[PDB]
Amino acid sequence: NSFSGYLKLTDNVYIKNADIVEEAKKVKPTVVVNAANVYLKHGGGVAGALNKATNNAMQVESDDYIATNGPLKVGGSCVLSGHNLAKHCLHVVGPNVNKGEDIQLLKSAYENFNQHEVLLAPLLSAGIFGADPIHSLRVCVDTVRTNVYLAVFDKNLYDKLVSSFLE
Numbered sequence: 001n002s003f004s005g006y007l008k009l010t011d012n013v014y015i016k017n018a019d020i021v022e023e024a025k026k027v028k029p030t031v032v033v034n035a036a037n038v039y040l041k042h043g044g045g046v047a048g049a050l051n052k053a054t055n056n057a058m059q060v061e062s063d064d065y066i067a068t069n070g071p072l073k074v075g076g077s078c079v080l081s082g083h084n085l086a087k088h089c090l091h092v093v094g095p096n097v098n099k100g101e102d103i104q105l106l107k108s109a110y111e112n113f114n115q116h117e118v119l120l121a122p123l124l125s126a127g128i129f130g131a132d133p134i135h136s137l138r139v140c141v142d143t144v145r146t147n148v149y150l151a152v153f154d155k156n157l158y159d160k161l162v163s164s165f166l167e
């Protein structure tokens, strides 16, 4: 959990402009969060990047979990191996607003983080999931009580998020 160069927002929420994959290699976190979908198909974005960094081992393990347990629910999660990126990967399904899912489920999605003492995570439901990223940060700060290190891979968005928090 050797996090470096983060800006502390609250006593339990930190943020950095960085690729979560690059962070997981630098930090060696106990938990890395994946911004998953309900069938754990890691086809692009954050999930595709984390899977590629495991040379597809994450996808094979994910398909086996879905075979035995069935899909996740929106707002739910599961704990699987972290492979070479972390001890564990917490796969969390935030709502995809662009596909009609309820933004209120973003609180349930962040609540999964509270079962783990320290996490490296992306900004849930941002990017192509369509949630307003300033709203996602506000839900993160109001919901997560354990120690969360957010990696946001875009300097323009990072600057807007820090300026919004400090208003």
Ligand SMILES: CC(C)[C@H](Nc1ncnc2[nH]ccc12)c1ccc2c(c1)S(=O)(=O)CCC2
Pocket (backbone or CB within 6 Å): 018, 019, 020, 021, 035, 044, 045, 046, 047, 049, 122, 123, 124, 125, 126, 127, 128, 129, 151, 152, 153, 154, 157
């Ligand atoms: C807002 C983006 C800059 C951010 N991208 C990232 N944030 C941190 N490490 C990253 N590695 C590669 C991309 C990447 C982001 C955060 C959350 C979501 C996505 C994107 S998505 O994949 O479009 C859909 C799922 C939710």
